[PDB]
Amino acid sequence: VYADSFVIRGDEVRQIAPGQTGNIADYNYKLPDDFTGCVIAWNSNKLDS
Amino acid sequence: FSRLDPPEAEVQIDRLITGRLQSLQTYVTQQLIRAAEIRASANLAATKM
C-alpha cells in the first residue's frame, strides 16, 4: 500500500479519477486507468488556510 | 473513445463487441445447418453416380 497527500482548490477533486482530465490532471498528478485502491477525501477548510 | 470515461468506454465497447460477435456466432451456426443439408445431398449424389 502507498499513501499521498495533496492540496486541491475546490471543484477539481472530481477530476481525480481513473481517466478524466483537467487542469491538475495534465500538468500534475494523474491517475492511471487500472486504479485498484481508492480515495479518502474530506473538507479540510480547518487547517490549510 | 472521444469523450467518454475510459473505464466506462470499455463497458460501452463490451456490449458492442458482444453484439458484433453474436452476429458472427449466429452466422457460423447458420452455415453448419446448411453444410449438413448439402452433405445429405452430396452423399445422395455420390450414391446416384
From Swiss-Prot, chain B:
What task does this protein carry out?
Subunit of the fusion protein that is processed upon entry into the host cell. Mediates fusion of the virion and cellular membranes by functioning as a class I viral fusion protein. Contains a viral fusion peptide that is unmasked after S2 cleavage. This cleavage can occur at the cell membrane by host TMPRSS2 or during endocytosis by host CSTL. In either case, this triggers an extensive and irreversible conformational change that leads to fusion of the viral envelope with the cellular cytoplasmic membrane, releasing viral genomic RNA into the host cell cytoplasm.
What is the official name of this protein in its record?
Answer: Spike protein S2'
Q: What is the gene called?
A: S
- Residue range from the parent sequence: 981 to 1029 of 1273
- Source organism per entry reads Severe acute respiratory syndrome coronavirus 2 (2019-nCoV)
